[PDB]
Amino acid sequence: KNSKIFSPFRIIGNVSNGVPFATGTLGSTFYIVTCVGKTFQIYDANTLHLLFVSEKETPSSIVALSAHFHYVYAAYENKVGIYKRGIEEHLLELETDANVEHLCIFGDYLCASTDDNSIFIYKKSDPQDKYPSEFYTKLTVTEIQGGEIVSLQHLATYLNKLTVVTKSNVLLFNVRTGKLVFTSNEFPDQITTAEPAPVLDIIALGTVTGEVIMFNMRKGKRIRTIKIPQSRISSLSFRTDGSSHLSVGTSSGDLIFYDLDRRSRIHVLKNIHRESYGGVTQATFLNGQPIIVTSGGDNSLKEYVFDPSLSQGSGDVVVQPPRYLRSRGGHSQPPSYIAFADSQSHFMLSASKDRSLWSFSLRKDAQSQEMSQRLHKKQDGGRVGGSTIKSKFPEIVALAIENARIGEWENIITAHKDEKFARTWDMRNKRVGRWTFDTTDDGFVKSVAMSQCGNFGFIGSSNGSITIYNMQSGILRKKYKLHKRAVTGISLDGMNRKMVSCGLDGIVGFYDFNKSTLLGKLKLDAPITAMVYHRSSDLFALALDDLSIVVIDAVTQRVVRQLWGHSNRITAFDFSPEGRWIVSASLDSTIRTWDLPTGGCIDGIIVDNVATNVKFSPNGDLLATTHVTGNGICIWTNRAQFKTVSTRTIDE
Amino acid sequence: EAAWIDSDDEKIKVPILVTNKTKKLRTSYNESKINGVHYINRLRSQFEKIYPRPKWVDDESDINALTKILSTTYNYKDTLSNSKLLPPKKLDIVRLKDANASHPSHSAIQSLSFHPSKPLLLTGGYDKTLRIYHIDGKTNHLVTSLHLVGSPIQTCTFYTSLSNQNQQNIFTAGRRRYMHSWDLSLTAKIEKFSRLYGHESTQRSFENFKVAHLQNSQTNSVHGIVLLQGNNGWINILHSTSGLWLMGCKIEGVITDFCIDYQPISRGKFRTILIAVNAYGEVWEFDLNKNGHVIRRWKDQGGVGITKIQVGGGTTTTCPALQISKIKQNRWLAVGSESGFVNLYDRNNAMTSSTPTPVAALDQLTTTISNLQFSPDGQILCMASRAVKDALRLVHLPSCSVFSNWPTSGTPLGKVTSVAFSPSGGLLAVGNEQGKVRLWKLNHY
């Protein structure tokens, strides 16, 4: 459903999704266009900077994309879009209902293979224009000639011909006369990849059992065969700087390098990408260069470089192994928690189910960096426990950042899944901190908070006990015991004077903080799942179990609004930075905006994925949502920062 | 030469001078349009001078057995289960949850034994209670727990008979003139053995006992014996159900330790041998399926303060046989001493010499050997000392070489005061003086 407050801006934190990317070459530089769901992203291969993002989201997922000099050809559901600088220049509708799923571009021809084994040829109108635009003919690979088309390529110096790689065969079409020139002999196992060699009229085929064939497309024979047992081959690339190496890419995430001249195996990069997300999905040498760009389905794009040889006379036999060079990446699993790091809306902290805490930049995607989990030394000098085989921390339930004393000491306080202590982090250093706050009642951490002096962190355990630690020195200061069931929300005043806790027994406790008294206790009518404290207006909102949002102020301890309308469990909510609205999101696939002055629902968005996190910026710039599927962070901009919206209630 | 000709390139006719890239592949300044096969050859030579022709394409197309097998393989060692016996010098041992972590011990854990069949671990110490833990990986819980008042326990053993394998007794004893026997029934019926049937002067403390199997040798009827180490040189063997004193075996010197070996004879008949060591180093072997008479008397080569003998490689008292046909002869015999020296004898040849030489004398840990236990397969020996911290080694054998990667400097072994091997899982339990059983799993099993 279209909205009237927030309009979609971008989905940040995404680098790849395991569509095989395309490389392109403007002049002597290289760009790398990778698909992220329904948009592509162009990267500058010398530094992996994000040059361009495609202007509109395609109506379905981009499934095959190529790149000549200035133009990028992206094939999604039925049609091929021709894009320059992100902005779409042309759209080629195919005459079928079959999904286009391969394409090549050579000459005046764009050739797009669908999944019903038909091939659509498109021609330029006059050979001076920029992209193939008019329909020319249709080719068909029937079941007699070959299997399913597994690749579609044009190996060089072949005057208007096309190498079609089917699952068992290699056909060669003349795309002007519409003819089938040559059909090879069969192959005893199903071939998955193809790459044209820089040797003349040689293609390289990669099978579903472990072998690379070097087919000579003019003799009709195979030149040589390379066997990699029990490995499905997903990429093939060739080195073109006077060193005849081949790089094969294996769907258990391996990148194997071969010398073709002296028939040895140079090196293997093991676990270069995750097998569970597809292995190495596209690996290609930037040509003339000893650097190879890999990309996998785990939302990661890397570069590896070959240093020059260490022997000053031999060289060709002492090949130094490939080392790592720059890389970009994001979360490999959908994020589980979201926060904004500062009031400027520049960085945002983001934790995922793949057990990593990233810090993503809303201004420039090169500044996105993974917060490191390299632990400090123990304070006394004793040994730290844990496994020797280091793994990442359990996935993050909650976090609370308060950069009042930033750079001074620990700054982020975070709570993990089914473990009884809350770690700290430093956002300035972008690393873990020295302290892990215990709950001291053998209960898991259900909530965290920290004061805006930056001195105090608050832990709320599942046995109902708030413990207040000092963020500088890491020791227990106080411990309140009011609740008996799990404490799901803690917050404190902007003047460190009254704190407010809410547990899932449905009591909101109001404590004085300087004196350790309680000021009161208010029993609601459902267990409370989440609190958000708007700190300037002193109004906090509770997501109750009866699917209402109770807005209650902390000064006079009354329920002052009660917002009804959600049909399932409220996953998240957040206040406007001016504290006028509250945006919630719930498991009925909806996001609502409530004007708590008038107490009604301003806007509603039906979004197909359920939004698990909603956060406003600390200025009124952006909304950041986080959904069930999708490894990134969806970013919306409120149009009411530029116009004024009517606080008049919607329905249906 | 070529496997196809398409008959379209010959009648095509290209221009040349329209674009700057094709403007270079002319051979004259008057050429403007050329034939298709000529044009294909021009840009074939141009492709060949952009990317120069390598040697792997025209060099070769597809006693070399080793080179071929190396060019196909990627791993070069035995894979997972086609090993069946341990690799030396590098263990494979993960750490599980500490077994008594569920219910803490109030004393140093003095003895420790697994069940022969069930997943049960019995711990016990000087706080005069004994605890049984259902062990697994994650959650080692406490089955039951029995606190004998006024009776600190020092040795506790699961006994399970060979006839019906349905008794499941626990024999436990400390520095007392009695020994308790709990009959496992899942109230608790325990009995007390407190009568040496005329032999109370030579047995003033029931601390060092061991439980074993004995055959009648006129019927094929087995029964358990407990064996008590007494003052002078005496071992008092008595029935494990009736408590009747059966026989006694006296060695000459200060009796320090003893172990039980079994050897099969025929179908359904075996023979029990008691192996008892002087402090000085001389070893007696008593046949006790007949009257307790000496059959062999030999001497440990070296060794002057002898604390602990153990056998292994077959059925010991800590790897017990559940069925009488599964009784095996022990291969190895380790005699561990006060200096930390452990002689190791191979009884496949060292039952004949009467001054037999050890296959190796280990010297890796330097203080008094207080535990040494063989893994049930008989491929690891575990030396352990309760005198300094972290004094435990697992020596691989037959190679007689200590594993060098475990334990490390960060293994929380503690002051190792007991150790036990699982009969089936390949699993160490190590109890220290703080009251903690730590638990490890050997991934070879």
Partner: peptide, 28 residues
């Protein structure tokens, strides 16, 4: 002293590439 496995600073170079736009011809 062991051998020095230090990495050089890598800069890209100017490479020539065959473009396939000359691999398409029209008939009269």
């Amino acid at each position: 002293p062991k051998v020095v496995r230090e990495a050089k600073k890598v800069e890209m170079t100017e490479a020539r590439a065959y473009n396939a736009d000359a691999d398409t011809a029209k008939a009269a």
